[PDB]
Amino acid sequence: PLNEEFRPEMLQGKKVIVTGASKGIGREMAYHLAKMGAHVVVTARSKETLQKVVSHCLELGAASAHYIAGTMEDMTFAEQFVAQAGKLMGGLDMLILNHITNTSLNLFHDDIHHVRKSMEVNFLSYVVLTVAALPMLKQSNGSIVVVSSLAGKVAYPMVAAYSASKFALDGFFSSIRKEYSVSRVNVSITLCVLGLIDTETAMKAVSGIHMQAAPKEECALEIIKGGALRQEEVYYDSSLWTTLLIRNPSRKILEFLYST
Amino acid sequence: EFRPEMLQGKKVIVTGASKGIGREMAYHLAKMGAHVVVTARSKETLQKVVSHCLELGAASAHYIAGTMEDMTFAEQFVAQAGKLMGGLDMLILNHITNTSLNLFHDDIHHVRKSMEVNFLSYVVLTVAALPMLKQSNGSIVVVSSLAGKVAYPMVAAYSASKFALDGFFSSIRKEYSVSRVNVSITLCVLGLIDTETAMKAVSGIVHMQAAPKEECALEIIKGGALRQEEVYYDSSLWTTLLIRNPSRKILEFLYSTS
Ligand SMILES: NC(=O)c1ccc[n+]([C@@H]2O[C@H](COP(=O)([O-])OP(=O)(O)OC[C@H]3O[C@@H](n4cnc5c(N)ncnc54)[C@H](OP(=O)(O)O)[C@@H]3O)[C@@H](O)[C@H]2O)c1
Ligand SMILES: NC(=O)c1ccc[n+]([C@@H]2O[C@H](COP(=O)([O-])OP(=O)(O)OC[C@H]3O[C@@H](n4cnc5c(N)ncnc54)[C@H](OP(=O)(O)O)[C@@H]3O)[C@@H](O)[C@H]2O)c1
Ligand SMILES: C[C@@H]1CN(c2ccc(F)cc2C(F)(F)F)CCN1S(=O)(=O)c1cccc(-n2cncn2)c1
Ligand SMILES: C[C@@H]1CN(c2ccc(F)cc2C(F)(F)F)CCN1S(=O)(=O)c1cccc(-n2cncn2)c1
Structure with missing residues (x-):
């Protein structure tokens, strides 16, 4: 946990992966990383929009910028990609897991395909990517950034499948963080709990089905700062006070009462 | 408010009932004269459980054997079990894939398996049981853990799956409130229980004070019977108190208005 105020320069020449960076917030994080002269590798399924994005990262000031098109549904591609992007940058410092499968607001009836798809893409691919990135991150004492949501901390309706995967991210990576402490692994793990963000x-x-959205740009920055400064959790939401209710002191205690 | 006569003639499914807490719940339900259908992979042990349940005073007691790794078996087990009992009043989800205490070592197969068995099958069982439960205005009781509420080392995959249950079943619980579907969802957060x-x-490694599996089962059963939302059961009273999360409830309401 860096006891320090953030400075864009922290990312100058940092080698960074950004998943789900063909649009929305993933696109935003790429630009910010470009301006800070970082080496970026972006990924997603559409090769077209990815190029459009790469094109722009270069002209913003990236030290380099590549895209690799694929689908995170394919666990063999997730592993490959991370090695491909390892080659492209000569190492890895930060791993930003951002991508999610196409979700929408709907009551849950019998959509067991979508529940499994959600787990596989939103959660299980993150673990694979992580396993592949880890050897290189350990070398650069780098960072894992996992983008999550309010729905991954509290229960809302019409996002059950989605919320289930985000909850799964919390439990897994939090447990891994604890393991990196005991195991003395020096790789930061940052979990970002985002409120409504105004992505396309x-x-x-x-x-139609009535709240308030926060700017995707500041949102992309906040994620990157929490990562750079190696924080445990990052909150972002239109309301400031909202962010205050998310931390859980009780969880903090129960976690200690059984460490020793 | 609880009284064993609440289960009298209630059609109940208990999963992972061949051993540990599953076994103990069947026995409790069998003293209350519930109709009970149990399951697991081992028929040899499931038979021992089924006979004992009848000696105890079960309205009826049968087993159907299979692995919950098989979503097809899981979907059929619930039809077959409901048809046999002429209905379903309570669904106790309690089985987990064999887990040991270990640091993550890139064993993705184990993570996938844990999600599949500990979590996705719970949803398949639920989808299959829902119609009968809307019909009995009954209950779904999901059995989880402390590691499904807070982070510990050595249980990553186990933890992700238990977290998954909370986020899914808590979200659908809120969905059933606005759909006026009348079936309760009880998430049970259990600390260390003294099952074998x-x-x-x-x-082997460091240990704690383990609560009794027998009482634990009854608490799970009572909780569901009273249609509570959560149920905490641990040795320490200092645990139960901390497991509750008041901020969450406030956020849940705050953005529920929509
Ligand atoms: N925006 C919000 O309101 C909000 C709120 C809470 C949390 N979050 C979190 O913030 C992150 C981004 O939200 P977002 O609105 O920016 O998502 P988004 O706008 O829908 O874009 C998501 C990204 O995922 C990629 N993707 C989709 N399917 C994929 C697959 N099968 N394999 C690989 N990549 C795939 C998409 O590119 P392609 O489809 O072209 O492959 C896209 O780049 C997510 O993790 C979300 O959980 C967002
Ligand atoms: N005991 C604890 O320390 C503790 C703490 C917190 C939470 N819990 C929760 O309490 C519940 C029961 O724990 P437990 O101690 O009673 O475990 P347990 O005693 O070992 O019983 C596990 C049950 O699941 C069955 N099972 C295993 N694999 C299966 C599969 N692939 N498909 C279907 N069934 C399968 C086992 O029978 P077969 O092998 O014959 O199939 C057995 O009946 C679990 O949800 C657990 O997470 C337990
Ligand atoms: C609603 C947003 C955007 N979602 C999202 C993100 C990217 C997508 F591509 C698609 C979605 C989704 F369709 F789920 F909205 C995922 C869920 N989130 S959230 O967890 O930040 C959130 C905040 C506040 C309220 C809620 N409520 C849910 N029901 C009621 N309130 C959810
Ligand atoms: C360790 C026990 C028993 N486990 C369990 C249940 C059934 C099984 F079949 C196997 C296990 C397990 F191997 F995880 F022990 C599941 C996890 N739990 S727990 O969530 O009740 C719990 C409470 C307090 C501390 C911990 N810690 C774990 N590491 C550090 N603290 C876990």
Whole structure:
């Protein structure tokens, strides 16, 4: 945990992966990383929009910028990609897991395909990616950034499948963090709990069925700062006070009462 | 408010009932004269459980054997079990894939397996049982853990799956409130319980004070019977108090208005 105020320069020449960076917040994090002269590798399924993104990262000031098109549904591609992007940058310092499968707001009936798909993409691919990135992150004492949500901390309706995977992220990576402490692994693990963010995808699914969205740009920055400064958790949401209710002191105690 | 006569003639499914807490719940339900259908992989042991349940005063007691790794078996087990009992009033989800206490070592197969068995099958069982439960205005009782509420080392995959249950079943619980579906969801957060599988997994390394599996089962059963939302059961009273999370409830309401 860096006891320090953030400075863009922290990312100058840092080698960073960003998943789900063909649109929404993943696109935003790429630009910010570009301006800070970082080496970026972005990924997603659409090779078209990815190029558009790479094109722009270069001209913003990236030290380098590549895209690799694939689907995170394919566990063999997740592993490969991370090695491909390892080659492209000569190492890895930060791993930003951002991508999610196409979700929408709907009551849950019998959609067991979507529940499994959600786990596989939103959660299980993160673990694979992580296993593949770890050898290189350990070398650079780097960081894992996992993007999550309010729905991954508290229960809302119409996002059950989605919320289940985000909860799963919390439990797994939090437990891994604890393991890196005991195991003395020096790789930071940052979990970001985002409220409604005004991405193209989000605003479509929400409209009509009535809240307030936060800017995707500041949002992308906040994620990157929490990562750079190696914080445990990062909160972001339109309301400030909202962010205050998310931390759980009781969870903090129960976690200690059984360490020793 | 609880009284064993609440289960009298209640059609109940208990999963992972061949051993540990599953076994103990069947026995409790069998003293209350519930109709009971149990399951697990081992028929040899499931038979021993089924006979004992009848000696105890079970309205009826049968087993159907299979691995919950098989979503097909899981979907059929619930039809077959409901058809046999002429209905379902309570669904006790309690089985988990064999787990040991270990640091993560890139064993993704184990993570996938844990999600599949400990979590996705719970949803398949639920989808299959829902119609009968909407019909009996009954209950779903999901059995979870402290490691499904807070982070510990040595139980990553086990932890992700238990967290998954909370996020899914808590979200659908809120969905059933606005759909007026009348079926309760009870998430049970249990600390260390003295089942044989638990005590061989921990006692090696550092250990704790293990609550009694028999009482634990009854608490699970009562909780569901009273249609509570959560149920905490641990040796310490200092645990129960901390497990509750008041901020969450406030956020849940705050953005529920929508
Ligand atoms: N925006 C919000 O309101 C909000 C709120 C809470 C949490 N979050 C979290 O913030 C992150 C981004 O939200 P977002 O609105 O920016 O998502 P988004 O706008 O829908 O874009 C998601 C990204 O995932 C990629 N993707 C989709 N399917 C994929 C697959 N099978 N394999 C690989 N990549 C895939 C998409 O590119 P392609 O489809 O072209 O492959 C896209 O780049 C997510 O983790 C979400 O959980 C967002
Ligand atoms: N005991 C604890 O320390 C503790 C603490 C917190 C939470 N819990 C929760 O309490 C519940 C029971 O724990 P427990 O101590 O009673 O475990 P247990 O005693 O070892 O019983 C596990 C049950 O699951 C069955 N099972 C295993 N694999 C299966 C599969 N692939 N498909 C279907 N069934 C399978 C086992 O029978 P077969 O092998 O013959 O199939 C057995 O009946 C679990 O949800 C656990 O997470 C326990
Ligand atoms: C609603 C947003 C955007 N979602 C999202 C993100 C990217 C997508 F591509 C699609 C979505 C989704 F369709 F789920 F909205 C995922 C869920 N989140 S959230 O967890 O930040 C959140 C905040 C506040 C309230 C809620 N509520 C849910 N029900 C009621 N309130 C959810
Ligand atoms: C360790 C026990 C028994 N486990 C269990 C249940 C059934 C099994 F079949 C196997 C296990 C397990 F191997 F995880 F022990 C599941 C996990 N739990 S727990 O969530 O009740 C718990 C309470 C307090 C501390 C911990 N810690 C774990 N590491 C550090 N603290 C876990």
